[PDB]
Amino acid sequence: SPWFGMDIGGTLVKLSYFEPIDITAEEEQEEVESLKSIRKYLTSNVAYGSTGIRDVHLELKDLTLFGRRGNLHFIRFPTQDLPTFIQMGRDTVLCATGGGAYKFEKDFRTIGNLHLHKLDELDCLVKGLLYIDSVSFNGQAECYYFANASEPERCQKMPFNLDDPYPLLVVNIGSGVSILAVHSKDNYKRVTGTSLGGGTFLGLCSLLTGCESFEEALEMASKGDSTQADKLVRDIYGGDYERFGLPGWAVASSFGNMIYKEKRESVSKEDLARATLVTITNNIGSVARMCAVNEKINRVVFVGNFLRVNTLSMKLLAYALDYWSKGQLKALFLEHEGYFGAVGALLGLPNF
Amino acid sequence: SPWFGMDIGGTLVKLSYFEPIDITAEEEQEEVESLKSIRKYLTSNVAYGSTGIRDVHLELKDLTLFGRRGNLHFIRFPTQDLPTFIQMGRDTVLCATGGGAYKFEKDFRTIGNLHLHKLDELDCLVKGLLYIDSVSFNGQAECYYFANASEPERCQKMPFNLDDPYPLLVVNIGSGVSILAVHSKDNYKRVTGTSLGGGTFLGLCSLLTGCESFEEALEMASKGDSTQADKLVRDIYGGDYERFGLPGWAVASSFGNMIYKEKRESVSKEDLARATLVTITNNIGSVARMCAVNEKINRVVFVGNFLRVNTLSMKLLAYALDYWSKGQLKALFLEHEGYFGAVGALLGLPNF
Ligand SMILES: Nc1ncnc2c1ncn2[C@@H]1O[C@H](COP(=O)(O)OP(=O)(O)NP(=O)(O)O)[C@@H](O)[C@H]1O
Ligand SMILES: Nc1ncnc2c1ncn2[C@@H]1O[C@H](COP(=O)(O)OP(=O)(O)NP(=O)(O)O)[C@@H](O)[C@H]1O
Ligand SMILES: O=C(Cc1ccc(C2CC2)cc1)N1CCN(c2ccc(Cl)nn2)CC1
Ligand SMILES: O=C(Cc1ccc(C2CC2)cc1)N1CCN(c2ccc(Cl)nn2)CC1
Ligand SMILES: [Mg+2]
Ligand SMILES: [Mg+2]
C-alpha cells in the first residue's frame, strides 16, 4: 500500500506522498503491478488530469520515514474534483484530515477494502508543522521572516530558527481562518477563528472583478491601487490622527469611498482586487495581533494556501504586524505552508 | 449665539442644538432677528434642505443645561453637504469634533468672527455618552439590551442600568470602527480599531447590489439569505465541527461560496446585501469580544450610526456576543447612539 496523507479542505485537497527510493531487488519483484503503476504515474507526471498539480519545488528528498529512505512529494487539487480522484481510485490505509474527511467518508469507502482513518484537522497541522521544521527543507530553513519590513529598500526574506518553537501562534488562512496557540508538542488550543479568509478574497474578487482564478485575482491586485476604493484616515481628518497615533495612510474604512457613485464609476477592477486583498489581509493581521497579545505570544506564524504565490499579502502582514505592534510581534512564514495537515495525517500511519 | 455641538464624521455630520424654553420677556426683545430666524427655522422644520433631518423622537425635553431650561435637539446631514451648510451660514462659538473639525477648519472660518474650537472625537464621545445616560431619555433608560437573545421567541428589548458605568467597552461603529476602554470619567483609551465598519457595508453593498441608500441596503438585506453566498461549517464538515465546538451553521468563509461560478449566477442581490451585513456585523462582534477579554470588561456598548434603524445587526450582535462568549459578555445599546460626540462637543462650551 502506498503511503499517503490527505487533508480535504473546503477549497483544496492536499496530498503528501512518500516515495521509497531504497527498493531492493526482491521488493521490486513482489510489487503488484497496480502499485508500480501509481508510483510511476505520480513520479513521472507533474500535472494530474486537468486540475491536479505536484509542487515539485517543495519535494523533500532522501527523507528517512518509518525506517525507510524516500522522497516526500506534495500534491494538490480542488476539492470540487475529489469525485474524479475517487473514481480513478476505483478502477490501502488512508489517513485523512480536514472537514472533508468527515463529509466524504462514505465516498472513500466506495473503494473496496480501503480503510479510512479520520484525524483532527488541527492535531495534524501541529504535528506536520513541527515535523517539517525539524527535518528542514533539504538542509535549508523551513521558517522565514521579512527582515526590516518597515523599510522597503531593505526588506528581504531571511531564515528563522524554530528549534525551541514554543510558544507559537499559528494562523491558518484557508477558506476561513483558524488561530491556534501552541504551548508544547501536546498542548495546543484553537484560540478563535475568523470567517474573513482566503475564500472571502476569492469570492469577493470574483463578484467584483469577474476574475476566474486565484492567480488572476492576485495579478489584478498587483496592478491596482486600493486607496481608490478605501477611505483613509487622511480622507476624514485631512492628515494624521495625532492624538491616537493613527497615520494618515491607514485605512479608516475599507471600501468606504465606494459609497459615492462617482467614485464607483471611476474605480478599476484592478483597484477593487487590491482593495479586497488589502482588506482581508489587514483584518487577519489585526486579529492575529490581538490573539498574540491575549495569549502572551510574540511569534506568529501564518500558514494555509491564501499565501501561496502571494508575496503581496506576506509583505503586508510582515509590515503591518511589526508596525502596529510597535515591533513586539514577528510575522513568520513557512515554505510548506499549505501542506502541514496532509503531512501530519501521513505521520499518523503507524497508529493503524 | 445659539448653542450647538457638532461632530463632523467621514460620512455624517451630527449636530446637537439646545433650544431655550425659559425665554423671558426682556430677553425676547434683545433677540437679534437672525437669532430668532435660526431658532424658528430649526424648530419649525424637521427636514432641512434636501438632506438634513431632525430626529424628533430623540429630543430631550425640559433639560437644564448651563443653568437654563430647554430642549436638546438632534440633527444630521451628510458630510458631503457641509458646503451648503457653511454657505447657508455665511448669508457664534462652535465646538466641533470628529475628523472634519480639522479637515474643514479653514472652511468654518469663512464665517465672519466665528470661533471654532476643535475637541477630540473620543473625549467628546465619552463625555456625551455619560451625560445622556445620566440625565435619562425623558425619564426612560438610555441603555438597553436584548434579553434572552439565544431564543427568538423570548428575545425582547429591555432597559439596562448604567449608574455605575465603569468599566465599559465602547464600540463606535461609524465609517470604520473605534474600540474604547473606559475605566473612569477621566481614564479611557482607544484599545484598537478596525476598518471593516459601516462604510464597508454601504460601499460593498453599493458595488454588489447597486443600492442607492443605507436604508435600501438594509431593506434588501432583510429579504436575503446570507447562506447563499457564505460557506458554512456544515458545507466543509457535513455538520458540526464537534472537537472545537463549532456549530454547523457558523460561517466558515464569508462569501466563500462565491468562488463557484454557478453559485455566483444564482445568488440574488438581496442575498448579497444580507451576506455583506452579516459579514461586517460578525467581524465587529468578534473584534469586540477579543478586546473585552483582553481588557477584562464584560459590558460592551455599541454606538455609531451603522446601527440606526438596523435591528438586524443589533440582534445579530446581541446573539453572537452571548453565544460566542458562553454568556460572559452582554451586548448593550443606546437610544442616542449616533450623537454622543456632538453632545460632548456642546458640553465643552463653558471652557471658552
Ligand atoms: N489554486 C488555487 N485554487 C483555489 N484557491 C487557491 C489556490 N491557490 C491558492 N488559493 C487560496 O487558498 C485558499 C484555500 O487554502 P487552503 O489552506 O487550502 O484551505 P482549505 O483547507 O481548502 N479550506 P479549510 O476547510 O477552511 O481549512 C483559497 O481560499 C484561496 O484564497
Ligand atoms: N442616512 C445615512 N447615510 C449614510 N450612512 C448612514 C445613514 N444612516 C446610517 N448610516 C450608516 O452609518 C455609518 C456612519 O456612521 P457615523 O457614526 O455617523 O460615522 P461617521 O462619524 O460619519 N464616520 P467616522 O469619521 O469614522 O467616525 C455609515 O457608514 C452607514 O453604515
Ligand atoms: O471560527 C470561526 C469561523 C471559522 C473559521 C474557520 C473554520 C475552519 C475549520 C473550518 C471554521 C470556522 N468563528 C468563531 C468566532 N466567530 C465569532 C462571531 C461573532 C462573535 Cl461576537 N464572536 N465570534 C466567527 C466564527
Ligand atoms: O484603527 C484602525 C482603523 C481605523 C478605524 C476607525 C477610524 C476612525 C477615527 C476615524 C480610524 C482608523 N486601525 C488600527 C489597527 N489596524 C491594524 C492593521 C493590521 C494590524 Cl497587524 N494590526 N492593526 C487597522 C487600522
Ligand atoms: Mg484547511
Ligand atoms: Mg464618527
From Swiss-Prot, chains A, B:
Task: Report which reactions are catalysed by this protein.
Answer: (R)-pantothenate + ATP = (R)-4'-phosphopantothenate + ADP + H(+)
List, alphabetically, the CDD domains matched: ASKHA_NBD_PanK-II_Pank3 (cd24137)
* GO MF term list: acetyl-CoA binding; ATP binding; pantothenate kinase activity; protein homodimerization activity; vitamin binding
Name the NCBIfam families on file: panK_eukar
According to its UniProt record, this protein's enzyme class is transferase
Q: Which family does it belong to?
A: Belongs to the type II pantothenate kinase family.
Its UniProt pathway annotation is: Cofactor biosynthesis; coenzyme A biosynthesis; CoA from (R)-pantothenate: step 1/5
Is Transmembrane given among the entry's keywords? no
Q: Give UniProt keywords alphabetically.
A: ATP-binding, Coenzyme A biosynthesis, Cytoplasm, Kinase, Nucleotide-binding, Transferase
* Lineage: superkingdom: Eukaryota
Q: Where does the record place the catalytic residues?
A: E121
Gene Ontology biological process terms from the UniProt entry: coenzyme A biosynthetic process; phosphorylation
Organism of origin is Homo sapiens (Human)
Binding positions (acetyl-CoA): S175, S178, R190
Main location per UniProt? cytoplasm
Where, per UniProt, does this protein localize? Cytoplasm
Upon changing R190W, the result is:
Increases affinity for ATP and decreases affinity for acetyl-CoA. Increases acetyl-CoA production
Q: Please describe the quaternary structure of this protein.
A: Homodimer.
Tissues expressed in: Highly expressed in the liver.
What protein does this entry describe?
Pantothenate kinase 3
